[PDB]
Amino acid sequence: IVEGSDAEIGMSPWQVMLFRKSPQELLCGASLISDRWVLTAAHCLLYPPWDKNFTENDLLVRIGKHSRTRYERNIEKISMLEKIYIHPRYNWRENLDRDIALMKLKKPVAFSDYIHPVCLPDRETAASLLQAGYKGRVTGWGNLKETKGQPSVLQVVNLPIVERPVCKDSTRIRITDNMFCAGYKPDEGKRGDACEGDSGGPFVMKSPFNNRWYQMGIVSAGAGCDRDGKYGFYTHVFRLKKWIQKVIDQFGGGSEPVDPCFRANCEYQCQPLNQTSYLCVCAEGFAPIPHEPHRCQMFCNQTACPADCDPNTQASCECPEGYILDDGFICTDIDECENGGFCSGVCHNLPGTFECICGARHIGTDC
Amino acid sequence: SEYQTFFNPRTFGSGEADCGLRPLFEKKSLEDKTERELLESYID
Numbered sequence: 420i421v422e423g424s425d426a427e428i429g430m431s432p433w434q435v436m437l438f439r440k441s442p443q444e445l446l447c448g449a450s451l452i453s454d455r456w457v458l459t460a461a462h463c464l465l466y467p468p469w470d471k472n473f474t475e476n477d478l479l480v481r482i483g484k485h486s487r488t489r490y491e492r493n494i495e496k497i498s499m500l501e502k503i504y505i506h507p508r509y510n511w512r513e514n515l516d517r518d519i520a521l522m523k524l525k526k527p528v529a530f531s532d533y534i535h536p537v538c539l540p541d542r543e544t545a546a547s548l549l550q551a552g553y554k555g556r557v558t559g560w561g562n563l564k565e566t567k568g569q570p571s572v573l574q575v576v577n578l579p580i581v582e583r584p585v586c587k588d589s590t591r592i593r594i595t596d597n598m599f600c601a602g603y604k605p606d607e608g609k610r611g612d613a614c615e616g617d618s619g620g621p622f623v624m625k626s627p628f629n630n631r632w633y634q635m636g637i638v639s640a641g642a643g644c645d646r647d648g649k650y651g652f653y654t655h656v657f658r659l660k661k662w663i664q665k666v667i668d669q670f671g672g673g674s675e676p677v678d679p680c681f682r683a684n685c686e687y688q689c690q691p692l693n694q695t696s697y698l699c700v701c702a703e704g705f706a707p708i709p710h711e712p713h714r715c716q717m718f719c720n721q722t723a724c725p726a727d728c729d730p731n732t733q734a735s736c737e738c739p740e741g742y743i744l745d746d747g748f749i750c751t752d753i754d755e756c757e758n759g760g761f762c763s764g765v766c767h768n769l770p771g772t773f774e775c776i777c778g779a780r781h782i783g784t785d786c
Numbered sequence: 787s788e789y790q791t792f793f794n795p796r797t798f799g800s801g802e803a804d805c806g807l808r809p810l811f812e813k814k815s816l817e818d819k820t821e822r823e824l825l826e827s828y829i830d
């Protein structure tokens with residue numbers, strides 16, 4: 420968000436962060452619409468020109484977040500995806516027409532002071548509020564400039580809707596009715612925009628009729644960020660409610676040399692033990708895969724561990740399974756008990772996994 | 787806050803009826819710092 424400010428705590432409790440597992444990195448914004456459903460942009464998930472094509476196991480959904488980077492123990496909640504649904508007429512070749520996607524969560528999320536869904540507008544709410552010069556609000560963890568330009572905390576800015584003739588004449592791309600645009604004009608002397616990394620986040624408006632927040636759009640596109648006489652573009656949520664309805668109805672009811680090493684085919688490294696036998700060994704902070712011992716993987720006994728980022732890079736970070744990246748380029752264990760969603764029984768957390776006592780005891784499983 | 791529901795909770799899950807009302811704001815009769823800004827844009 421360019422020329423936004425820090426969000427107050429609890430200000431956008433429907434704000435959802437999409438988080439790539441491997442490598443560990445913020446992917447996009449999204450929004451929470453019920454305890455099972457998340458709304459976002461299709462290009463976050465799928466955009467072939469940037470080799471983007473994620474399936475469900477590639478991502479995490481983190482909810483109730485405020486800090487960009489801190490793992491917010493006892494506040495944020497991590498949800499896994501059951502399924503992704505991209506609009507079937509999503510036009511990435513040309514327009515980003517219908518830049519929209521739905522995400523169903525494996526389990527319902529627990530609501531709290533920080534986690535709470537947004538309303539989707541009806542015909543009348545849309546009609547009345549989606550009008551030039553009325554302001555909505557956009558939030559995200561994206562870039563602070565076009566040209567670290569990364570915020571430590573969720574950013575917010577309020578922006579007026581812009582009338583089509585002006586949106587239209589601001590760009591050579593064919594604008595459709597499934598979009599609208601927003602932002603100040605050069606002579607208005609305030610400025611503000613969404614920027615890269617804010618895609619999928621909500622454009623919201625507080626209704627003066629019932630005092631509720633409605634998501635009118637989804638951060639979609641623009642040219643640079645905060646350019647004079649340019650305007651950010653949003654997916655027109657109401658226009659696509661048809662489709663939302665249809666996917667939710669259809670899919671919602673769920674929840675020879677002498678060298679022992681010669682033979683080896685180790686992923687990282689061979690070490691000879693005897694003259695007659697070898698051992699596949701692994702880089703520091705790694706270990707062999709218990710049932711797949713020629714292959715290798717990250718490992719941690721402990722509550723936290725350093726991230727395997729790429730040496731010369733200052734990022735590209737991996738973590739072990741059941742850990743997440745954190746401040747200080749660290750992997751910290753996930754507490755699947757505090758989180759909820761992993762265990763109906765009596766839960767004991769464990770570094771990398773957990774224990775679930777089902778009423779027989781399960782390690783890393785429910786019942 | 788009169789809100790009719792649109793979706794079936796069998797498929798949508800829970801939350802719809804109390805959507806859009808913030809625990810730390812609307813539910814406590816508090817305004818966020820810039821909330822008013824948006825209100826006033828309607829008064830126009």
Ligand SMILES: *[C@@H]1O[C@H](CO)[C@@H](O[C@@H]2O[C@H](CO[C@@H]3O[C@H](CO)[C@@H](O)[C@H](O)[C@@H]3O)[C@@H](O[C@H]3O[C@H](CO)[C@@H](O[C@@H]4O[C@H](CO)[C@@H](O[C@@H]5O[C@H](CO)[C@@H](O[C@@H]6O[C@H](CO)[C@@H](O)[C@H](O)[C@H]6NC(C)=O)[C@H](O)[C@@H]5O)[C@H](O)[C@@H]4O)[C@H](O)[C@@H]3O)[C@H](O)[C@@H]2O)[C@H](O)[C@H]1NC(C)=O
Binds near residue numbers: 692693696
């Ligand atoms: C360098 O050099 C070597 C070269 O290879 C190398 O590796 C060796 O590896 C093994 C490890 O074992 C293997 O593990 C690998 C996985 O890494 C796996 O691929 C492989 O399949 C092997 O399991 C070391 O040996 C160790 O293993 C054995 C067993 O695990 C162990 O001792 C044995 O204990 C047995 C009992 O527990 C005992 O046998 C019992 O005998 C009685 C009486 O006969 C039987 O009783 C009844 O029998 C009747 C049938 O007649 C049945 O009807 C009844 O039901 C039986 N009774 C019951 C109660 O059921 C029992 O059934 C048993 O048969 C046996 O005699 C052994 O003493 C041993 O102590 C080891 O722990 C090797 O030592 C070696 O390391 C090295 O790794 C290389 N370098 C380095 C640095 O390590």
Ligand SMILES: *C[C@@](*)(O)[C@H](CCCNC(N)=[NH2+])NC(=O)[C@@H]1CCCN1C(=O)[C@H](N)Cc1ccccc1
Binds near residue numbers: 463617618642643645
């Ligand atoms: C995916 C989002 O992070 C991002 C948001 C950009 C919002 N910008 C402003 N100023 N509000 N969207 C994009 O980067 C999209 C995805 C693919 C490329 N793209 C663009 O916005 C281009 N700058 C323009 C464009 C390219 C292709 C199709 C439509 C528009």
Ligand SMILES: *[C@@H]1O[C@H](CO)[C@@H](O)[C@H](O)[C@H]1NC(C)=O
Binds near residue numbers: 467472
């Ligand atoms: C996306 O990835 C899946 C998984 O391999 C593949 O089946 C599909 O063809 C890909 N789609 C596109 C549009 O690249």
Ligand SMILES: *[C@@H]1O[C@H](CO)[C@@H](O)[C@H](O)[C@H]1NC(C)=O
Binds near residue numbers: 706720
């Ligand atoms: C985890 O650490 C303990 C002691 O800290 C060690 O003995 C054990 O072998 C470790 N796990 C592995 C797979 O090495």
Ligand SMILES: [K+]
Binds near residue numbers: 752768
């Ligand atoms: K854990």
Ligand code: NA
Binds near residue numbers: 611645647
């Ligand atoms: Na602008």
